[PDB]
Amino acid sequence: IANQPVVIDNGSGVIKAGFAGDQIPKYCFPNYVGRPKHVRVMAGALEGDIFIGPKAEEHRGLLSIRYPMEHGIVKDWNDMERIWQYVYSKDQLQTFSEEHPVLLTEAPLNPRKNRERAAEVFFETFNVPALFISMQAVLSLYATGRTTGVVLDSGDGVTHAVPIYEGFAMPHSIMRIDIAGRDVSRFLRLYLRKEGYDFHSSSEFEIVKAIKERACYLSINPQKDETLETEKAQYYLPDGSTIEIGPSRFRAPELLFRPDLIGEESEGIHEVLVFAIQKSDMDLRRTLFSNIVLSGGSTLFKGFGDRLLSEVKKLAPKDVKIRISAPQERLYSTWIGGSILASLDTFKKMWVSKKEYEEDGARSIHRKTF
Amino acid sequence: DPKYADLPGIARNEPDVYETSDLP
Amino acid sequence: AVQNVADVSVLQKHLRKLVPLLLEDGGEAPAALEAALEEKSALEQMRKFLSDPQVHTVLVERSTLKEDKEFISYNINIDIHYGVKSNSLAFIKRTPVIDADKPVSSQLRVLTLSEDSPYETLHSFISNAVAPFFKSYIRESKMAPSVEKKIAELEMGLLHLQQNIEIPEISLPIHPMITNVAKQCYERGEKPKVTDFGDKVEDPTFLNQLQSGVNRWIREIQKVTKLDRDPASGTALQEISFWLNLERALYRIQEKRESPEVLLTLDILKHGKRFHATVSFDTDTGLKQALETVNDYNPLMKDFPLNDLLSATELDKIRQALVAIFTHLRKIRNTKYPIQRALRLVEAISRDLSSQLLKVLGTRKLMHVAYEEFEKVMVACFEVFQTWDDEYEKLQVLLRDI
Amino acid sequence: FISYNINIDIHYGVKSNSLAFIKRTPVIDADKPVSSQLRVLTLSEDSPYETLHSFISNAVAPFFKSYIRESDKMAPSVEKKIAELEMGLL
Amino acid sequence: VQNVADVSVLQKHLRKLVPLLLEDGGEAP
Numbered sequence: 001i002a003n004q005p006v007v008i009d010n011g012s013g014v015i016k017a018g019f020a021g022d023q024i025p026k027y028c029f030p031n032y033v034g035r036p037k038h039v040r041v042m043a044g045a046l047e048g049d050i051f052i053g054p055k056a057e058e059h060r061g062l063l064s065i066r067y068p069m070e071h072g073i074v075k076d077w078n079d080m081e082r083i084w085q086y087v088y089s090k091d092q093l094q095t096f097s098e099e100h101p102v103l104l105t106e107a108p109l110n111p112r113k114n115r116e117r118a119a120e121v122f123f124e125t126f127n128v129p130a131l132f133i134s135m136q137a138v139l140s141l142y143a144t145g146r147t148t149g150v151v152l153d154s155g156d157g158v159t160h161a162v163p164i165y166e167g168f169a170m171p172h173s174i175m176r177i178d179i180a181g182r183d184v185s186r187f188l189r190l191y192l193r194k195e196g197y198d199f200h201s202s203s204e205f206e207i208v209k210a211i212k213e214r215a216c217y218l219s220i221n222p223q224k225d226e227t228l229e230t231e232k233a234q235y236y237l238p239d240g241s242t243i244e245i246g247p248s249r250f251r252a253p254e255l256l257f258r259p260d261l262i263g264e265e266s267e268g269i270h271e272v273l274v275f276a277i278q279k280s281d282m283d284l285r286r287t288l289f290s291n292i293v294l295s296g297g298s299t300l301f302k303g304f305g306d307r308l309l310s311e312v313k314k315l316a317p318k319d320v321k322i323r324i325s326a327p328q329e330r331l332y333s334t335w336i337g338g339s340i341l342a343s344l345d346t347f348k349k350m351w352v353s354k355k356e357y358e359e360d361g362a363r364s365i366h367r368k369t370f
Numbered sequence: 371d372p373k374y375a376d377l378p379g380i381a382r383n384e385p386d387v388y389e390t391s392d393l394p
Numbered sequence: 395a396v397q398n399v400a401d402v403s404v405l406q407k408h409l410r411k412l413v414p415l416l417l418e419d420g421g422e423a424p425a426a427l428e429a430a431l432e433e434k435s436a437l438e439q440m441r442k443f444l445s446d447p448q449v450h451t452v453l454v455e456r457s458t459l460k461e462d463k464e465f466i467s468y469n470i471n472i473d474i475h476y477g478v479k480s481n482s483l484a485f486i487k488r489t490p491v492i493d494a495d496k497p498v499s500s501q502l503r504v505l506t507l508s509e510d511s512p513y514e515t516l517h518s519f520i521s522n523a524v525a526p527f528f529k530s531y532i533r534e535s536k537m538a539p540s541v542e543k544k545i546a547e548l549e550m551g552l553l554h555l556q557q558n559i560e561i562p563e564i565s566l567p568i569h570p571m572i573t574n575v576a577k578q579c580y581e582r583g584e585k586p587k588v589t590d591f592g593d594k595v596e597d598p599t600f601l602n603q604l605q606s607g608v609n610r611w612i613r614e615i616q617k618v619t620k621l622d623r624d625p626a627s628g629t630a631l632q633e634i635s636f637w638l639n640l641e642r643a644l645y646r647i648q649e650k651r652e653s654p655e656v657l658l659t660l661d662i663l664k665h666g667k668r669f670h671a672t673v674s675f676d677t678d679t680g681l682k683q684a685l686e687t688v689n690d691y692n693p694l695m696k697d698f699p700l701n702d703l704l705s706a707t708e709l710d711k712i713r714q715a716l717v718a719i720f721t722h723l724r725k726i727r728n729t730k731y732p733i734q735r736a737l738r739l740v741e742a743i744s745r746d747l748s749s750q751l752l753k754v755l756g757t758r759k760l761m762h763v764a765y766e767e768f769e770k771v772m773v774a775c776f777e778v779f780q781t782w783d784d785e786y787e788k789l790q791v792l793l794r795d796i
Numbered sequence: 797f798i799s800y801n802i803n804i805d806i807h808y809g810v811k812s813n814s815l816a817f818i819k820r821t822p823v824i825d826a827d828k829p830v831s832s833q834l835r836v837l838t839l840s841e842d843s844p845y846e847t848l849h850s851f852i853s854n855a856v857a858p859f860f861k862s863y864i865r866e867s868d869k870m871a872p873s874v875e876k877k878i879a880e881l882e883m884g885l886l
Numbered sequence: 887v888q889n890v891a892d893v894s895v896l897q898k899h900l901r902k903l904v905p906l907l908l909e910d911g912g913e914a915p
């Protein structure tokens with residue numbers, strides 16, 4: 001059918017889109033807010049005020065980039081609708097809300113009000129015929145071919161693990177701590193001011209984000225490597241100024257493992273996953289030692305996987321098999337898993353009909369997603 | 371493949387699965 | 395639009411150019427096509443196909459009269475009947491002015507309602523070449539899509555209502571290069587692993603072609619696991635026959651698709667991370683579903699006393715068939731069949747029973763010949779009626795148990 | 797350009813014509829007349845949509861009409877969809 | 887298994903039939 005489903009790969013900071021069966025999302029872009037800040041007299045500027053694209057990524061000195069997705073939980077749903085209208089733009093989709101099924105990606109254990117308000121959007125403003133939201137973990141296993149596993153991921157300020165065998169109902173066996181790289185970038189900015197580099201703008205912060213995600217690693221031996229001497233090699237600004245390596249690009253991401261340094265009692269991914277293993281059953285934990293379904297795009301740094309394996313060695317007992325899912329396209333793999341998921345037979349019954357929203361919607365939405 | 375070309379990139383000189391030491 | 399159009403002899407000549415090789419015994423202008431499109435009424439028909447745009451075809455049916463040597467002769471009129479008593483070979487007037495100025499064939503066509511069934515020949519010629527021309531027309535970049543969809547739907551419904559077998563085989567074309575690798579990895583290295591293919595991994599287009607072929611196999615799975623019919627068309631025996639036929643048909647197809655070469659190619663595609671086809675192929679499986687279904691019905695779907703009905707000249711043997719059938723029916727505990735479908739089933743068979751009663755009792759001449767003969771035959775009929783009644787009542791009691 | 801080829805490739809362009817005898821007994825044999833039992837199909841030199849409409853209207857209108865007023869069994873719906881497709885392509 | 891119109895047989899039939907279905911009758915054009 002020409003009414004092919006719509007795969008929308010969300011994320012706390014990144015979002016992708018496409019159709020069913022497609023292998024690459026032709027539309028990949030962030031999640032933010034933006035509006036101009038100065039005054040022109042001579043005409044010939046761009047209008048619309050909320051731009052997404054090269055102009056947005058060019059006229060950064062004008063817009064006020066914000067982020068409504070507080071740990072993914074969005075608050076400027078209206079602005080998101082504006083963004084979704086942009087998703088339907090003349091160069092983006094050119095389709096109408098009442099023309100295609102829509103599969104949506106998600107982060108679990110969120111309040112019902114989220115799905116409520118989303119249903120209101122895509123069934124009143126937008127009017128989707130078939131809308132469904134689910135867990136990317138299943139999509140991840142689809143993209144990897146596995147069926148059972150401990151699916152862990154990292155967004156931008158969100159992290160969560162789903163240790164489940166073949167989609168079996170194990171809600172008590174699920175862990176989630178939503179914290180990641182955004183504050184690490186702000187923490188990096190803190191280090192910058194610590195050695196005299198103050199930054200405050202949204203665009204400025206995004207440049208810092210580029211610095212972070214561009215230059216960061218993990219020195220396996222914290223104390224030991226600290227005793228040694230660094231390089232402090234300098235990258236250069238658009239103007240070309242000093243960007244040293246510092247203790248920063250490796251000491252700052254370790255805060256994700258020693259979260260108390262930010263001033264917050266937490267556990268660190270390793271302990272989190274260990275607790276998740278304890279949340280499992282001894283008659284399955286061996287497979288779970290083999291079941292290491294890792295993901296998360298923020299995770300893509302140096303000194304990450306193998307050092308984390310050493311962490312596991314310190315944590316897990318004897319006889320544990322490392323079987324880590326780790327291509328860098330695990331983000332896209334969620335979108336791809338949803339694409340193949342959309343290309344299915346039973347998928348019709350899997351979604352939510354529009355008439356169901358016309359009848360009740362809400363409770364039925366929670367019933368179909370569970 | 372063009373899949374890795376059109377995107378920012380996949381794993382660089384490092385696999386996905388690893389393994390512990392012999393006789394753990 | 396024509397005034398000084400080609401002669402009626404020329405009209406029968408073009409009709410012979412199309413009709414003698416098909417509606418006759420080959421050759422040039424024969425007497426059959428001449429009598430078809432050359433008479434006075436046929437001259438008016440020639441003026442209707444050349445000097446008029448209303449007649450979109452000149453029906454030259456291949457009529458025949460046997461019981462001598464079937465006089466296979468063409469008859470050109472406006473009677474384009476179906477293939478029921480003649481092979482209608484119409485001179486399709488694709489253009490109105492099919493005359494002496496332009497060619498007699500370039501400004502026309504030869505549309506023929508073949509000697510076979512109209513639905514059968516229509517679906518055959520349609521799916522073979524009619525959908526291809528319009529498909530290319532629409533494929534060159536809807537109304538054209540709805541027309542092609544109507545052509546395909548008409549061929550589907552025509553083959554469905556025409557072909558009663560309707561269960562063909564499924565082709566699994568392994569790509570010849572892969573078969574070559576299998577042969578080279580079949581001489582003494584009989585198991586073709588991945589390594590032998592090597593650079594064939596970087597063939598997303600080629601492997602996509604194979605992926606598409608597997609998708610056609612998936613479409614075939616849908617075709618296999620897509621339908622059953624109402625338990626009322628003809629006798630239910632026909633249904634039981636296709637129940638078992640579809641059972642071993644499924645098993646046959648299963649053994650065909652379980653060829654490890656195809657499975658191995660799927661393993662290669664699996665290595666190619668084309669999880670699409672693999673998983674979708676696994677999801678389309680209505681395989682064990684239908685297999686288990688007819689395996690479930692299978693005990694009762696076996697060895698039914700079918701010819702006892704067609705082999706009972708006496709009402710006593712009719713009653714024998716009644717008892718044998720109802721006692722054969724008792725295999726319900728292991729089948730789990732619907733009540734309504736069973737009702738419809740038994741009712742269709744009961745109407746068939748009444749028809750057999752007509753077949754046996756229609757020559758008694760009860761009101762014509764000796765009345766006592768009718769008394770005896772009807773007493774045997776009474777035996778049949780009450781045995782059907784009470785044994786059917788026992789079936790009803792067992793249905794209460796069900 | 798005159799390009800006549802005796803193949804099974806039934807292609808159609810803007811002015812692509814064809815000539816066939818789609819055998820009622822598909823096995824075109826030389827032992828008997830292969831042209832005898834053959835529902836012909838001769839695509840004229842016109843537009844493929846117009847040629848398809850004229851061919852459908854010439855081979856399914858009176859044929860399914862006669863098979864619908866008598867007698868395989870789906871000739872009424874076949875005639876309805878055929879006349880609709882013929883008029884739609886026209 | 888072999889009841890097929892030969893290369894010369896099918897070629898002759900198609901040649902004698904292409905002109906009757908492509909022009910105003912005649913032999914093989």
Ligand SMILES: Nc1ncnc2c1ncn2[C@@H]1O[C@H](COP(=O)(O)OP(=O)(O)O)[C@@H](O)[C@H]1O
Binds near residue numbers: 214296299
């Ligand atoms: N070079 C990099 N290395 C590691 N992480 C990165 C790099 N570049 C970007 N990232 C981060 O990876 C994250 C992608 O994970 P994803 O789940 O898509 O995040 P989100 O949920 O915020 O969309 C992005 O938030 C981005 O900040």
